[PDB]
From a paper:
Pro116 is located at a structurally important kink region in the BCH domain of S. pombe p50RhoGAP (henceforth called yeast BCH or YBCH). Alanine in position 116 (P116A mutant) orients the polypeptide chain beyond position 116 in a manner similar to that of proline in the WT structure. Moreover, the hydrogen bonds and buried interface areas between the monomers of the dimer are largely similar between the WT and P116A mutant YBCH structures (buried area 2861.5 Å [WT] vs. 2882.3 Å [P116A]), which suggests that the scaffold of the dimeric BCH domain maintains its structure and thus function irrespective of the amino acid at that location. Contrastingly, at the same concentration, the P116A mutant protein in AUC shows 70% dimers and 30% tetramers (dimer of dimers), indicating that higher order oligomerization occurs among the P116A mutant of YBCH. Despite the expected role of proline in changing the direction of the polypeptide chain, we surmise that position 116 has a minimal effect on the YBCH domain, and that our analysis of the structure of the mutated P116A YBCH suggests that this structure is representative of the BCH domain family members.
p50RhoGAP is a key protein that interacts with and downregulates the small GTPase RhoA. p50RhoGAP is a multifunctional protein containing the BNIP-2 and Cdc42GAP Homology (BCH) domain that facilitates protein–protein interactions and lipid binding and the GAP domain that regulates active RhoA population. The BNIP-2 and Cdc42GAP Homology (BCH) domain is present in 175 homologous proteins (such as BNIP-2, p50RhoGAP and BPGAP1) and regulates various key cellular processes. For p50RhoGAP, the BCH domain also maintains the GAP domain in its inactive form through autoinhibition via the β5 strand, which lies at the interface of this interaction. We recently reported that the structure of the YBCH domain contains two asymmetric monomers in the dimer, in which the monomers intertwine to form the dimeric BCH domain, with the direction of the polypeptide chain changing at Pro116.
Numbering used by the authors:
A (entry chain C), D (entry chain D): 0 to 148
B (entry chain B): -2 to 148
C (entry chain A): -2 to 149
The structure:
């Protein structure tokens, strides 16, 4: 029975401290489904998550990305998570990706950081060293001569 | 070898401290050309490692990027791409970051738009290194976890 | 001046043809070095101008990015970024885009994620240069247009 | 009055051949509000547009971006368009942005080209020049000697 394989790829692991669902997906386990022939997978996957999250439920998603990357399993899991109906995106408290390779780590942090308004507000674009003196005193910094020419 | 770690310090270093006495780490972008002379090294990985020891896991700090003349490019482009894929704590804990470029608008017009179009969905995500880091956000006692987070 | 136009052709040129005799336009990325010598200029706008003369509107072609080098940069990210902000017809009409680089994944890992997370809404957009170009898609006779698209 | 300064920024300019609305936004016309004070502008705007597109209704949207960049007017009109309830994004058939400055044109084309799956499908990452031979024959190419060291 493959409905069991499909239950070790994605399952309800717990219920956090607010009593809302915490659904786990273990991306590396997308390899069990290679053994089947003439399957869809993403429709099987989509109707299964629909069985684990009904409409109106606020939940948390957690992706265990051990032994997968943006170019293999974690790529498709996340692409597939993005293709979900909007209510799944509206109703998540947070998505967690845990432990992937170095590439994908810095791929993810870049995407998240482009999206972090809290952070992109912190930038301040000045035209020369002179205009910095107002915020950080130039008498407080040892700098090479390159920054002065 | 050691010449490499010294070129790292000419690229990124603590220049001084502000009032409230916190680090002001500068990156003299330009100085990335010092690395063109090298054989095989993942520069960006070694550079992330250097910053990680310049600023420890909780201390508010300031960052400033110098890149005055245009050229091809000022490599300011690549320095902020690197800074954007850095650890999360380095973004939450930074007080302000100053770029000195003049022609900045042409650079960061693309990144301003990608930020505009960033979905509301993708602002919910957070990357974590080990599964222990997921505690504090969700207590792992509430959870059955797959056998791979165990030996 | 003329030296600048020559460094442009050393960077991006027509390389050859395939079948039915469609241009293969090579860009050797390591050749962005030639422009560090210069002062002033918007290199990115000059290169966009140069490609426009190398490939006319509706005409299929193949692109090849040569970046086998290493150190600070292969120049492949900077010239792929430049390629992504080119007019839509250059992307519709390219047959294939061969990027010759060893360590390529570590660069395009970031763009693969941004494409994954790109919304379906964003995919509905299109930039047009002039109000005239909109006629193709929605007929302008059907519409009241604000006086601003006019010059009474 | 002020409700009389919105129809000049957003109107149902007409209908396409398939008999669905087309909504014009003229991003420039957005300083007719610096003269008001108190006015929140963003919520009045959302209310106005909600009165031109009914919930179940497919439409087009065109942005006349004459005299605006990603750093003014056009940037806020798009940040605002992105802030809208999901049905406005599900329901558009297309979004046209017309005639902005060179920066923004390049910024817009870049975002769309990351989005465009048909485009990014066309890349093939070969490891060295030798592998290019199976696709484009090197008999056919004038190349500098650099591509061969």
């Amino acid at each position: 029975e493959f409905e069991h394989d499909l239950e070790r790829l994605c399952f309800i692991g717990g219920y956090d401290n607010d009593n809302d669902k915490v659904i786990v997906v273990v991306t590396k386990n997308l390899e069990l489904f290679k053994k089947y022939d003439d399957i869809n997978l993403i429709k099987e996957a989509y109707n299964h998550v629909h069985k684990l999250i009904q409409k109106d439920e606020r939940y948390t998603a957690v992706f265990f990305a051990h032994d997968s990357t943006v170019f293999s399993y974690l790529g498709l899991s996340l692409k597939a998570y993005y293709g979900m109906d909007y209510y799944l995106h509206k109703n998540v408290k947070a998505v967690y990706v845990i432990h992937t390779d170095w590439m994908s780590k810095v791929a993810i942090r870049t995407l998240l950081s482009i999206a972090s308004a809290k952070f992109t507000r912190k930038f301040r674009y000045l035209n020369s060293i002179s205009d910095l003196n107002k915020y950080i005193p130039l008498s407080h910094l040892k700098l090479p001569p390159i920054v002065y020419e």
